[PDB]
Paper text:
To re-evaluate this interaction, an SpSMN fragment lacking its unstructured middle region (SpSMNΔ36–119) was co-expressed with a fragment of SpG2 lacking the N-terminus (SpG2ΔN80). We could detect clear electron density for SpSMNΔ36–119 but no electron density could be assigned to SpG2ΔN80, suggesting that the latter had dissociated and/or precipitated during crystallization. The structure revealed the SpSMN N-terminal G2 binding domain (residues 10–35) and the C-terminal YG-domain (residues 120–147) encompassing the YG-box and the serine-motif. Two molecules of SpSMNΔ36–119 in the asymmetric unit (termed the glycine–zipper dimeric unit), interact via the YG-box residues of interfacing helices. Interestingly, a closer inspection of the crystallographic packing showed that each glycine–zipper dimeric unit is stacked upon each other in an anti-parallel fashion around a screw axis between S130 and A134, leading to an infinite stacking along the crystallographic A axis. This interface, termed the anti-parallel interface, buries a surface area of 592 Å2 which is similar to the 620 Å2 buried surface area within the glycine–zipper interface. Anti-parallel stacking of glycine–zipper dimeric units is facilitated by the serine-motif where S130 and A134 pack against A134 and S130, respectively, of the interfacing helix of the adjacent dimeric unit, through mainchain atoms. The methyl group of each A134 forms hydrophobic contacts with the W131 sidechain of the interfacing helix. The sidechains of each W131 are stabilized by hydrogen bonding to the interfacing T138 sidechains. Our results thus corroborate the previous notion that the [name] glycine–zipper dimers are the fundamental unit of higher order oligomers and reveal a novel anti-parallel interface between glycine–zipper dimers required for higher order oligomer formation.
Author numbering:
A (entry chain A), B (entry chain B), C (entry chain B), D (entry chain A): 10 to 35, 120 to 147
Write the structure that this text describes.
């Protein structure tokens, strides 16, 4: 009956939210690489400056 | 004339747009400081390692 | 004959040339990582700004 | 006497080292532009990629 369509809709709704949660996961890993990249840029910057004072 | 009183509306309308988005601005500043902090942790870690080698 | 023993000299002479210039090679690798690090800091900074605009 | 020549030589020696210190200054600024250029190449690369995901 019309119950099968409503059940199908909740399924498609579950897949929709499951998809955006993956999208959010991707944005999270992106911002972690952003932070590490700034850490290493500072590290090799400081390291070169330190070797020069030799 | 109208120009004086009209700007007083856009002026007030401006400060109220700021107020409505102070939290979002706070998250933004929080993440800028996060990024600068990790840069600097890296900087001073690399510097110290570079000075030690001499 | 001579070919076998002669190559053993150039072979050993090679590894010892490497040893004599490991520090200079270290400075070189340090500066390659410095360059890649700043590229990546820029990459992820620009990406995040580009995603935010949507 | 021969003291004037030795004094003249130390002067010319001072100018010689003062010149190479400028040369070293030029090599330094060159490597800073090298690093910034890689930063901006990454930045505009990331930024374009970010706008595309729109």
């Amino acid at each position: 009956d019309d119950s099968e369509l409503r059940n199908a809709f909740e399924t498609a709704l579950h897949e929709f939210k499951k998809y955006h949660s993956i999208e959010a996961k991707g944005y999270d890993e992106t911002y972690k690489k952003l932070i590490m990249s700034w850490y290493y840029a500072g590290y090799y910057t400081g390291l070169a400056e330190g070797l020069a004072k030799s």
